[PDB]
Design a protein around this ligand. Structure first.
Ligand SMILES: Cc1ncc(C[n+]2csc(CCOP(=O)(O)OP(=O)(O)O)c2C)c(N)n1
Ligand SMILES: Cc1ncc(C[n+]2csc(CCOP(=O)(O)OP(=O)(O)O)c2C)c(N)n1
Ligand SMILES: Cc1ncc(C[n+]2csc(CCOP(=O)(O)OP(=O)(O)O)c2C)c(N)n1
Ligand SMILES: [Mg+2]
Ligand SMILES: [Mg+2]
Ligand SMILES: [Mg+2]
Lengths: 555, 555, 555
């Protein structure tokens, strides 16, 4: 007996998934059983569906795709928040939901876990707004076409997708999937467009001596990181990153000149980019946060925007190509433009160590975290002042930084780091999460414990929502303090090997970090006591610009 | 300076809210400031937006309405789950989201907390599927009409509604709201219909000696609890409840004859209902869980269905009336029909006290919890075996029992008990939650601690999803155990006055209950060690019927 | 045998429908049979579903409600345009669609008249955007509730609504509807609010001497025509209408002072409104066309806006009332304010009779049409220069003018007049329609002929889209000329009593009108030869303002 659920599981295995995330409910139990029969995947359980969804999202940052299985409505609607986040962050997460028995359609039956009307279609209609494809299976006959359609579309678009499978069809006899080379099939490229684009680009660079590359947060989605390097080596020009693009270009590189983020840029990088004769933007996302409230937005005659399927410059826009293909072809023909590398250098941390027994500062915490980042390290940085600490940390080549600056859902980091570490266990896994963020999703630390995932968690306990205080202060920014370190042994109970530690000084942090490195059978949470008043100066400047922009009057 | 947010606050206070629930975010901060200016309300903060929504939902069970305020997308989509919950359970919860600055509409700008496209309307489009009204405010001029339409429709339909307010409109100058008697305005009743319905009902009851009232879960939504009592008193007939209707009819009543729930009914009640010549159903919801998988569903010649706005019986349907006005009018003219009360008795708990040092049983735990329920007690019972324990407990008249049997989102109980206790602090608040459920929403116990809410939480630690085991067993039912009692110390830190206790015997439970009653400055969690095998026999019988119905094969 | 379709037919009869409109399709044939069994209604067939929908719309203008019955998708989507129009113009039209057999739900079957996917819900999801209620019926048991919900909501909201009925459920056995007084039940009014609103309104009028009523296009939707007269009688002030409100206030009232429409107002009416101390706006719609491109929009301190459910003035807004109840209560307490009636005059047509043999002018045509308008005449005026001719015609009390100025769908007038004449056959029915408009819907004249409906059609053959030429000229405004008068013979064939006549002079028009008045057994089309450049001066002035407003550059 080969079933619909096995077809799904076999295709998920062919994507490269070694795991999928689940929360059981009576609409998906038979489905979950079919997925357990597949030998190439482990079925990982989560506390709640918001966390399950974000676990899949993190797994997708490790493996290029992921799958989250939930129950109808009560499960799926919370997961839709994580799916919207996958869409925002350009990740192929597949959300599969159990759905009502086929015999209930066209009857007028009221069903459990619904709003209590005869419409069972509302979940599909809701989820279409946060997915690139969305299908519902009510027969075994139609399942192959729909399963494959959602997976193929997700992988090609780099966007999440949705399936629902009727609870009484997940175990129904289904045809077997045929063999494949890859489930990712790109669109065929138009060589006329690439050629005309390259030649136009070469002509445009002729009278432009000061050239800067600006790397954007869609570069990984374009699968063009290597072609970005190739291009950079032939131009020999300065390379900068947008905040959300950290780790998508090696900061090791001899021509790297730091972070462009308007008035909160690395030293020199603002005037570098803003005075350049040619700015080559590689897959940028110029949203209100990245532009510091619409103040720092490169555009005009001096800008070339290289999106994932398009390049635009000099009054022209060339389409039917990929960033991968255009960057590779332009690399062949690009002239030397080294001027912007001369009389500049890669930015440094600029934090000399603190007196080891003094109260722990933000700079000092940032310094020790930075020293932990190897070339086999993944650092997950939460929305909060962690964006601004992570943004000023130099990293070695091969190191991966995970940011969620488009969606910006606080608490993302805990289940994301869990999913990421499950998907790339060979790497060292670090995360920086604020106290506020941590409270939304804290319970997934228990699943890190259950599955023995050695994430090192730097909890910044600054007694509130500090980034919100820098935008607009009020009573809503002040939260109930927990003993975050002591939470670990509650989640351990009898079995677990999590470790909960405290650090109120440089010397205490140093010692906690040693014990964290040695703890291999579970996570280690280092509660860092940082003063509420002790945040980055970059956060305070950005926050003021964001507050002004959000509050600007109507017309 | 009178503002849009102030207009909203004033109307919310006019509904009778003394609290509203919020999670801050930059899209709603200015709105939160305006709501804070209102003298008649306190602003209660939550850990996450899912919990914030269920806290409002619990508050609405106490006060008849509630408000949750969230930020765009990252907040709102989680809260949509709880709003779907509010729809399912017929509760006027208003969800208010902060939304984008008016100046970004029609520009093409990409905004933080969005999926990254130019569509800002997608949240409104999603939330329409789980609300009775949903509006978007982008000007102070239109705000009054949209605020009032949302609030009025919610209250009248007994369904949740949605508002989004542009972050730069919340503090814009607005006209003042006029004085009101009540924002609940009902539809005019059609007396021609009432009269004909009553006259037809009297004629239908002429040759029907065995009459039984079956009280349903929409009776509170109909605002017809008193009229139900008047009708029972006049008929003098037997009165039963459906599982979801507990506390909507007084179990004190001399003519009460227990729970009707198919094969898992109280003693006698199945035979009583199913053999009656007339069954008067008052506001039923005959879903798949309530009918035990379509096996126990009263319909046909012997059945009268009284919906909130309609009566159906004897091949006729009468509308333009309300359950309240029809029940009253029928009580005036109803014949005496006492035959079903003669010789029978109201059902008894029937649990003998255990030996005080024997390992704690489900029965013994149920016995001690049942003794805590007074006429001023609210018992919130979670989806789990707590549904079946709660449904076999007799309660005194005036006792309130909260079940979420249509939506059935595990974890609902914790934030719902929180909001309900905040809304009715004069009452004693008891909570029955399973270990599995507790893990989804655990963190809101920290808000009970923050706001000093003396909920007594009976945590049933049976080491997994036991109700899911009764449907279909597999590895997905077994969760990571926590030290649930010890979690209270973590949430307390230095501030709090919550108490965490364990009970493994009848005597240990007794002492923990006594310390629970004496703790007025915070919640008391009592972790009860119940065996995984030791669940009610009703759960097992009901579980098998549900599995067989859910799994029935396609056509 | 009492069926679902009979329940529907009986509820439609109870609203006051003596007709419903249909286009047969295999999905609705059985439903159409059920409807035909109803003794109180005739079933009227239309050429196409756009026309069917607009025929219902016109019927609703006569009788307050209407019904159009169509087939799935191929029928319903065209009808949605008319439904959109009904929403725009505040008319309770019920669109009923046949839909798929219930056994196809949850199967994956591909069905005829669909887009060819397994989704059959897409029609319902589309129509929700242009309706106040939308329900799908897949069982006889649920049919009564859904039928009554859509009808009651439509009548109370004064908006259209949607039903779909499965093609195998329309003939299914149903319970019978109970007797009613009226299917229109209003919301109970809040006396506290009315009292405060009237008392603040009186106080506000006490301090303001020059008062002017401005009658708006939602006054009929408010059902407040008579209360408006009472208010005008107690106030004794000048009364003006907005263009779309023509006929909603009697123009031979001694205090009527004409049309307010910015710079295209009738003589003296612009100054009268714009220099007033108080402007009482009774149910206005201030769209871009009504305000002459936002140049003439009364607002601010001298303005009181009475909506259908709200009153707003002097920094306050009162709700929980109706325009009907509020204006009646204000009519008993308001002060006398006659100053704006003194000196001024009710405006006249001001067109001298042309020399009878001179080429027909726009003025001469307008003069002769104005003469036909009696107290029991209904004039349907199409989008085009007819808007501007109708708006400069004085009409006696009781006369009705139908304009579609919110939706503005050219061609609406032909099927609208047809439905209106079917619904109000005791009246004289006149139509003004342009050549361009007529071409979209000309075939419904054949239905006028079929059903012997004596509409007098004045077809203005100005050879193109003259209103669009005044906005912005180009080749898209010039259309193929037809022999419009000769079309009547084609539709007559050997059977009908339509008359088609040409008028190129005042004498020929006079002769044609006399023949039109004598033709009782069918419509009379009078094709009037009007020069392309002979359009009203008001159209030119208005056209320029609209063009400038639409083209205004982005920011
Ligand atoms: C789900 C969600 N809710 C609310 C917000 C709004 N928000 C953004 S940053 C922030 C504060 C984060 O606090 P913390 O985690 O303590 O970081 P800190 O700024 O203190 O370092 C909030 C409440 C959000 N982005 N996502
Ligand atoms: C959000 C959500 N996810 C999943 C489910 C499916 N579900 C129903 S009962 C249940 C088990 C609850 O277990 P517990 O709280 O331990 O109570 P017990 O049955 O053990 O008494 C689950 C996972 C649900 N109802 N809601
Ligand atoms: C369905 C539809 N299509 C197009 C338009 C745009 N439009 C508005 S007025 C008009 C011209 C109408 O021409 P005619 O009926 O001859 O009247 P005239 O302007 O000549 O008086 C057009 C095409 C519309 N309102 N509705
Ligand atoms: Mg913080
Ligand atoms: Mg359990
Ligand atoms: Mg024309």
């Amino acid at each position: 007996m080969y079933t619909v659920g096995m077809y799904l599981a076999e295709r998920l295995a062919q994507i490269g998934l070694k795991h999928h995330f689940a929360v059981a409910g009576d609409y998906n139990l038979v489905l979950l059983d079919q997925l357990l029969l597949n030998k190439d995947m482990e079925q990982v359980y989560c506390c709640n569906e918001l966390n399950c969804g974000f676990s899949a999202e993190g797994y997708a940052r490790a493996r290029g795709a992921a799958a989250a299985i939930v129950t109808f409505s009560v499960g799926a609607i919370s997961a839709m928040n994580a799916i919207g986040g996958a869409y925002a962050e350009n990740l192929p997460v597949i959300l599969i939901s159990g759905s009502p028995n086929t015999n209930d359609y066209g009857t007028g039956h009221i069903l459990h876990h619904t709003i209590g009307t005869t419409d069972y279609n509302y979940q599909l209609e809701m989820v279409k707004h946060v997915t690139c494809a969305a299908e519902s299976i009510v027969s075994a006959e139609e399942a192959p076409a729909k399963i494959d359609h959602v997976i193929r579309t997700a992988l090609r678009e780099r966007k999440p997708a949705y399936l629902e499978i009727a609870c009484n069809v997940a175990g129904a006899e289904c045809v077997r999937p045929g063999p494949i080379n890859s489930l990712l099939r790109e669109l065929e490229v138009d060589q006329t467009s690439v050629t005309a684009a390259v030649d136009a680009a070469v002509e445009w660079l002729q009278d432009r001596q000061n050239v800067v590359m600006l790397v954007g947060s869609k570069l990984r989605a374009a699968a063009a990181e290597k072609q970005a390097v190739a291009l950079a080596d032939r131009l020999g020009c300065a390379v900068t990153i947008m905040a959300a693009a950290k780790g998508f270009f090696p900061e090791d590189h001899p021509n790297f000149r730091g972070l462009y983020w308007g008035e909160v840029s690395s030293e020199g990088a603002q005037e570098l980019v803003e005075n350049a004769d040619a700015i080559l933007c590689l897959a940028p996302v110029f949203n209100d946060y990245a532009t510091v409230g619409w103040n720092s937005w490169p555009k005009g005659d001096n800008v070339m925007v290289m999106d994932t399927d398009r390049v635009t410059f000099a009054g022209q826009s060339f389409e039917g190509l990929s960033l991968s293909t255009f960057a590779a072809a332009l690399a062949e023909k690009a002239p030397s433009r080294p001027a912007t590398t001369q009389g500049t250098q890669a930015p440094v941390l600029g934090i000399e160590a603190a007196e080891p027994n003094a109260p722990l500062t933000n700079d000092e915490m940032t310094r020790q975290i930075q020293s932990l980042i190897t070339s086999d390290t993944t650092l997950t940085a939460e929305t909060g002042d962690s964006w601004f600490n992570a943004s000023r940390m130099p990293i070695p080549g091969g190191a991966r930084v995970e940011l969620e600056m488009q969606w910006g859902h606080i608490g993302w980091s805990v289940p994301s780091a869990f999913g990421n570490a499950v998907g790339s266990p060979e790497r060292r896994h670090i995360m920086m999460v604020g106290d506020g963020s941590f409270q939304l999703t804290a319970q997934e630390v228990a699943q890190m414990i259950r599955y023995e995932i050695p994430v090192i968690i730097f909890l910044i306990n600054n007694r509130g929502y500090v980034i919100e205080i820098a935008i607009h202060d009020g009573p809503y920014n002040y939260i109930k303090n927990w003993n975050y370190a002591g939470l670990i042994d509650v989640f351990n109970d009898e079995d677990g090997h999590g470790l909960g530690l405290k650090a109120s000084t440089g010397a205490e942090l140093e010692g906690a970090i040693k014990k964290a490195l040695d703890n291999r059978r579970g996570p280690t949470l280092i509660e860092c006591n940082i003063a509420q008043d002790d945040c980055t100066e970059t956060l305070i400047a950005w926050g003021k610009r964001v507050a002004a922009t959000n509050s600007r009057k109507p017309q």
